[PDB]
Write an enzyme that holds these catalytic residues in place. Structure first.
Site, mmCIF file in Angstrom:
data_model
loop_
_atom_site.group_PDB
_atom_site.id
_atom_site.type_symbol
_atom_site.label_atom_id
_atom_site.label_comp_id
_atom_site.label_asym_id
_atom_site.label_seq_id
_atom_site.Cartn_x
_atom_site.Cartn_y
_atom_site.Cartn_z
ATOM 1 N N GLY A 128 131.872 26.509 100.570
ATOM 2 C CA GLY A 128 131.965 27.811 101.182
ATOM 3 C C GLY A 128 130.652 28.518 101.461
ATOM 4 N N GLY A 187 129.286 34.747 103.681
ATOM 5 C CA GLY A 187 129.618 35.534 102.512
ATOM 6 C C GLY A 187 128.834 35.225 101.246
ATOM 7 C CB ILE A 188 129.907 35.308 97.707
ATOM 8 C CG1 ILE A 188 130.425 36.742 97.745
ATOM 9 C CG2 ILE A 188 129.236 35.069 96.388
ATOM 10 C CD1 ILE A 188 131.286 37.113 96.580
ATOM 11 C CG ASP A 246 140.031 21.601 104.561
ATOM 12 O OD1 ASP A 246 140.170 22.089 103.409
ATOM 13 O OD2 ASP A 246 140.876 21.780 105.465
ATOM 14 C CE1 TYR A 253 142.773 34.717 95.652
ATOM 15 C CE2 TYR A 253 142.934 36.787 94.495
ATOM 16 C CZ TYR A 253 142.179 35.826 95.099
ATOM 17 O OH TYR A 253 140.821 35.938 95.141
HETATM 18 N N1 LIG Z 1 134.109 39.608 98.501
HETATM 19 C C1 LIG Z 1 134.651 40.064 97.372
HETATM 20 O O1 LIG Z 1 134.790 41.438 97.110
HETATM 21 C C2 LIG Z 1 135.151 39.109 96.332
HETATM 22 C C3 LIG Z 1 135.834 39.618 95.228
HETATM 23 C C4 LIG Z 1 136.350 38.752 94.285
HETATM 24 C C5 LIG Z 1 136.186 37.386 94.457
HETATM 25 N N2 LIG Z 1 135.504 36.894 95.537
HETATM 26 C C6 LIG Z 1 135.375 35.420 95.619
HETATM 27 O O2 LIG Z 1 134.166 35.000 96.243
HETATM 28 C C7 LIG Z 1 134.369 33.795 96.933
HETATM 29 C C8 LIG Z 1 133.927 33.966 98.380
HETATM 30 O O3 LIG Z 1 134.515 35.125 98.953
HETATM 31 P P1 LIG Z 1 133.867 35.773 100.263
HETATM 32 O O4 LIG Z 1 133.809 37.268 100.178
HETATM 33 O O5 LIG Z 1 132.605 35.066 100.606
HETATM 34 O O6 LIG Z 1 134.996 35.336 101.327
HETATM 35 P P2 LIG Z 1 134.899 34.361 102.611
HETATM 36 O O7 LIG Z 1 134.029 35.018 103.629
HETATM 37 O O8 LIG Z 1 136.275 33.989 103.061
HETATM 38 O O9 LIG Z 1 134.259 33.036 101.956
HETATM 39 C C9 LIG Z 1 135.062 31.903 101.792
HETATM 40 C C10 LIG Z 1 134.124 30.754 102.025
HETATM 41 O O10 LIG Z 1 134.760 29.556 101.668
HETATM 42 C C11 LIG Z 1 134.889 28.721 102.796
HETATM 43 N N3 LIG Z 1 136.173 28.015 102.787
HETATM 44 C C12 LIG Z 1 137.427 28.539 102.951
HETATM 45 N N4 LIG Z 1 138.308 27.513 102.892
HETATM 46 C C13 LIG Z 1 137.644 26.364 102.690
HETATM 47 C C14 LIG Z 1 138.066 25.058 102.581
HETATM 48 N N5 LIG Z 1 139.363 24.761 102.653
HETATM 49 N N6 LIG Z 1 137.131 24.066 102.394
HETATM 50 C C15 LIG Z 1 135.790 24.377 102.311
HETATM 51 N N7 LIG Z 1 135.370 25.678 102.433
HETATM 52 C C16 LIG Z 1 136.296 26.659 102.620
HETATM 53 C C17 LIG Z 1 134.651 29.597 104.036
HETATM 54 O O11 LIG Z 1 133.968 28.937 105.087
HETATM 55 P P3 LIG Z 1 134.722 28.124 106.239
HETATM 56 O O12 LIG Z 1 135.645 29.049 106.960
HETATM 57 O O13 LIG Z 1 133.654 27.616 107.156
HETATM 58 O O14 LIG Z 1 135.501 26.958 105.680
HETATM 59 C C18 LIG Z 1 133.731 30.665 103.482
HETATM 60 O O15 LIG Z 1 132.377 30.276 103.535
HETATM 61 C C19 LIG Z 1 135.842 33.484 96.769
HETATM 62 O O16 LIG Z 1 135.955 32.572 95.696
HETATM 63 C C20 LIG Z 1 136.496 34.805 96.422
HETATM 64 O O17 LIG Z 1 137.724 34.696 95.701
HETATM 65 C C21 LIG Z 1 134.985 37.736 96.489
#
Ligand SMILES: NC(=O)c1ccc[n+]([C@@H]2O[C@H](COP(=O)([O-])OP(=O)(O)OC[C@H]3O[C@@H](n4cnc5c(N)ncnc54)[C@H](OP(=O)(O)O)[C@@H]3O)[C@@H](O)[C@H]2O)c1
Length: 273
Positions: free
Chosen positions: A17, A21-22, A74, A168
């Site tokens: 990922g 994002g993160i 993926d 979730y």
């Molecule tokens: N933002 C917050 O306030 C927050 C709060 C609590 C927890 N988190 C955690 O932080 C992590 C990232 O969140 P985020 O804010 O960065 O959201 P995000 O923008 O959706 O990041 C998700 C990342 O994972 C990738 N991804 C999704 N499905 C995948 C798959 N099947 N195979 C490989 N890569 C995949 C996406 O890239 P692609 O689309 O290119 O695959 C993206 O880079 C998650 O674990 C989330 O639960 C975030």
């Protein structure tokens, strides 16, 4: 902020990922030490609705000092995981850190959640983290660093976190349960730990889920907490780290530099009482 250190020079970091994002933000912090970043995500072509691909991330990563190996992955497909792992080894010689950051979310409840969303959560979050871990472990054993870091929460068993979006919660809690197990299984060989943010973190995915923009912290905070963990020895294992807590230990007192709008109330993250 929390300064870079050099510790990760020439260390290879495989991050699920890391297209945005993160995940991307963790890559960029490790990148500033001259680390090698294996970018494992799905976005290989511009999509109309998402911002960024594995290739733009790769560029960003090089612009702040790292080397990037973009791979189409993926995490639902074991073959794509193992192919990227092989590409990392052929290219870099090893893997020193795995960050299980890929995740999918759907806040529906029992009658609301379509099976395809259930499976998506189970398969990207819990299953993905397991398989990515299984592929990387035999190489992590050989690393001078040897860290697995799951972006998942402490196992807080208050019914309030399950009453809604149960699917979730289970999916995320499964990633943290692998921490519990694997920390013990690989004691002395691989550090395994979780990291989770005290508050909501500004992210185009969190914006879509959330007006919420001003109630968030910058991805910088998690990036920085994750960098702190990466410098600990292999005896730092079995912990469920919260971003703010780990950075207080490291001397950070004034947290305003991490807020999107300093002053404004911050939204508590899920799973913390
Ligand atoms: N933002 C917050 O306030 C927050 C709060 C609590 C927890 N988190 C955690 O932080 C992590 C990232 O969140 P985020 O804010 O960065 O959201 P995000 O923008 O959706 O990041 C998700 C990342 O994972 C990738 N991804 C999704 N499905 C995948 C798959 N099947 N195979 C490989 N890569 C995949 C996406 O890239 P692609 O689309 O290119 O695959 C993206 O880079 C998650 O674990 C989330 O639960 C975030």
């Amino acid at each position: 902020m929390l300064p870079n250190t050099g510790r990760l020079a020439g260390c290879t970091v495989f991050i699920t990922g890391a297209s945005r994002g993160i995940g991307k933000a963790i890559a960029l912090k490790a990148a500033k030490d001259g680390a090698n970043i294996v970018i494992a995500a799905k976005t290989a072509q511009p999509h109309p609705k998402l911002l960024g691909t594995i290739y733009t991330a790769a560029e960003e990563i090089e612009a702040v000092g790292g080397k990037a190996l973009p791979c189409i992955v993926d995490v639902r497909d074991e073959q794509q995981i193992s192919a990227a792992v092989e590409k990392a080894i052929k290219k870099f010689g090893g893997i020193d850190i795995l960050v299980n950051n890929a995740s999918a979310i759907s806040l529906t409840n029992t009658l609301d959640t379509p099976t395809k969303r259930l499976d998506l959560m189970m398969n990207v979050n819990t299953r993905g983290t397991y398989l990515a871990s299984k592929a990387c472990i035999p190489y992590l054993k050989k690393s001078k660093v040897a860290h697995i870091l799951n972006i998942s929460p402490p196992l807080n068993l208050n019914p309030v976190w399950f009453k809604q979006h149960c699917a979730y919660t289970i999916a995320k809690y499964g990633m943290s349960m692998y921490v519990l197990g694997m920390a013990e299984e690989f004691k002395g060989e691989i550090a395994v730990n979780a990291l989770w943010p005290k508050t909501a973190i500004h992210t185009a995915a969190m914006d879509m889920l959330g007006g919420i923009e001003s109630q968030c912290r910058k991805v910088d905070i998690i990036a920085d907490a994750a960098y702190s963990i990466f410098q600990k020895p292999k005896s730092f294992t079995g912990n469920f780290v919260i971003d703010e807590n780990i950075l207080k230990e490291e001397g950070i007192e004034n947290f305003d530099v991490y807020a999107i709008k300093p002053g404004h109330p911050l939204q508590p993250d899920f799973f913390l009482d």
